[PDB]
Write a protein that binds this ligand. Structure first.
Ligand SMILES: N[C@@H](Cc1c[nH]c2ccccc12)C(=O)O
Ligand SMILES: N[C@@H](Cc1c[nH]c2ccccc12)C(=O)O
Ligand code: SF4
Ligand code: SF4
Lengths: 367, 367
């Protein structure tokens, strides 16, 4: 009975310590003092790492307003990969964090070749509207476009350009276009700019990411340090989540629709995707009942663990049964489906109103 | 009697035609129709080339407000190299052109490592104050800082990053840092942004440069073309001036003080620099009187031609005498000095008031 899977953690949690990334449990006593109980993603070890989130919670504890920031590429549809990020935002927002969400429409245009009108449409109706329907507060959340964020944010990007080398950027990105160079600096500015007085002066900011995104964060932290004497910036903190494996064994992508469920999928499309998902199940009903299934490798069990079963007892019960022989994939799938069906229907019923609201939460760029 | 020196023109004027650069004389009939008489720099062939300045003058002729734009690196002192640019601005401004001057303080910081406070000080007291004392109108001239120019200008730079390759930039600049990549895009935006409605909508803009600056202009023109469908931009026009050779035979630079006269040089410093200048004169007073001097190679004669003698008769008289044997360098130098002395004293007496005014012509960036 290891339902949370500490085993696969410990392995790289050794190597990430090299980058100053720590086990998330080291912040529990601070979470408590900050008046916060861990979210289920934290209890389950899905949020496994942090860097400097202690410093964030210390500020918060003494009454400082703290912030969380992330951004989204407005391309393709909003999926459960995206949902995992937003749920961390919602948890922090309910605990008093100021939330910033950047729309990466400059990067969309310049790196991904996405048209202006479409980037803006997708951002508002597919990203912001889904985040609102998920529960991000339309009034206190500050959404913005990279291309419409104002002089002091843009100044950072200009000044950061003097404080990084081609080689440092080549390390992070590989072979490096002007667009990618520009994207990299703008993203550091997305993270750091909220510390400027013109955007609220939030010195203490945490960014929720996957380990695979740390190199850009370390660059952003170096930029903050290298700006000493020009503008005073604190190194941003972070939390680290394991990435949810896709329904087809590979990473969730709008690119391959069967990898993931889109939050706008009609019930029949979603069910079919779910019933097609890879499992840790066996050759036949019969072999399953003798040995059991393998949840550690099962994408249905991961849907349960990351989204569909917030109750620890329910998901443990699924883990145990699967292993103990007591359950077949077909039934397991139908159980996850019924959680999914209800979440989708409540979600989609909020979505048309969220779209109306979304267009009023931002000023889209003129061109 | 070739005092204007067409000879050295024709040579490369062949090769620059490859880039679509034309002899400046092809625009005379348009200059006339636009209600403008050529400036002495134009009469003397010092402005030798143009690209698309016909299209500018056609707009102007039908009553459109046309613009000229250039920018300055706020580093070192304002010299007669800089003065030659500003005098072209002043001529255009008197003929109804809107003038924009960019201060390249982002490039100063990121490429040249110049501090923020100092870039800003130097820009205002050394560059803008000297331009005002020279006669640039403090009320109608729009001076701005790269780092303080606003969202729509910055958006261009973000979008341009998707429309140029590392190789195209490598061609212009050599090995290419993030700062240089950033400088190159910002400079295109300096030129193009005035076409946006938020900055006055000046579609028709001419940039006065030396031939050696054309590659960046061709890139800026390509960027305008490549933005079709995103923002409608006209290819900027240009005029081309020969560079004034330095007093020490080499190019004018704040780097080597004896190369040039600074507009703030006290009369004794300036005279000494002038009396030290390289000439086309001879071994001794005696050999000079037989053969003559060589004005084509003489940096005193070039001071006369570019600044000190706006009257064509006076400078021709210097050319002829020098050649005909009638004048020695010592006397020639003292004649140029007396023009210089008077120009400096009138100029410096306007400079303290221009400094006061200058601080009110711009909003310096916060950091
Ligand atoms: N570069 C990200 C989007 C992004 C822009 N700014 C950010 C800041 C934090 C996290 C992500 C981002 C992709 O996907
Ligand atoms: N890059 C130039 C300064 C500059 C910035 N923007 C410009 C636009 C036009 C001409 C020159 C500039 C140096 O010197
Ligand atoms: S019974 Fe459920 S947890 Fe076990 S392998 Fe099948 S789908 Fe996965
Ligand atoms: S006489 Fe004048 S123009 Fe002739 S070489 Fe001497 S300084 Fe130059």
């Amino acid at each position: 009975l290891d339902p949370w899977g500490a085993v696969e953690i410990k392995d790289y949690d050794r190597l990430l310590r090299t980058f100053g990334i720590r086990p998330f449990s080291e912040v529990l006593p601070l979470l408590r003092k900050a008046g916060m109980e861990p979210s289920f993603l934290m209890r389950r070890g899905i949020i496994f790492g942090h860097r400097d989130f202690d410093k964030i919670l210390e500020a918060k504890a003494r009454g400082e307003r703290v912030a969380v920031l992330t951004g989204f590429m407005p391309s393709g549809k909003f999926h459960f990969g995206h949902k995992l990020t937003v749920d961390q935002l919602i948890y922090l927002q309910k605990n008093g964090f100021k939330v910033f969400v950047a729309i990466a429409d400059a990067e969309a245009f310049a790196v991904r070749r996405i048209g202006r009108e479409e980037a803006v449409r997708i951002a508002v109706e597919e990203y912001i509207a889904n985040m609102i329907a998920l529960g991000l507060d339309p009034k206190d959340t500050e959404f913005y476009f990279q291309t419409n964020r104002g002089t002091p944010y843009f100044r950072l990007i200009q000044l950061f350009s003097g404080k990084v080398t081609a080689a440092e950027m080549e390390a992070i990105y590989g072979e490096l276009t002007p667009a990618k160079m520009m994207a990299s600096l703008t993203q550091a500015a997305d993270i750091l700019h909220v510390q400027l007085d013109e955007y609220g002066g939030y010195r203490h900011v945490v960014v929720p990411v996957g380990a695979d995104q740390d190199p850009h964060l370390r660059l952003t932290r170096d930029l903050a340090d290298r700006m000493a004497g020009v503008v005073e910036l604190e190194r941003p903190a972070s939390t680290y989540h394991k990435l949810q494996p896709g329904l087809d064994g590979r990473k969730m992508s709008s690119s391959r629709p069967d990898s993931t469920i889109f939050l706008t999928d009609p019930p029949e499309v979603a069910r079919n995707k779910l019933f097609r998902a890879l499992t840790g199940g066996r050759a036949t009903a019969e072999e399953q009942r003798r040995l059991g299934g393998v949840p550690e490798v099962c994408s249905v069990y991961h849907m349960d663990l990351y989204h569909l079963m917030p109750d620890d007892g329910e998901v443990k019960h699924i883990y145990t049964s699967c292993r103990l022989g007591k359950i077949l994939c077909g039934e397991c799938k139908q159980i996850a489906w019924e959680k999914l069906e209800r979440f989708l229907a409540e979600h989609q019923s909020r979505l048309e109103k969220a779209k109306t609201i979304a267009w009023k939460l931002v000023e889209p760029p003129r061109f």
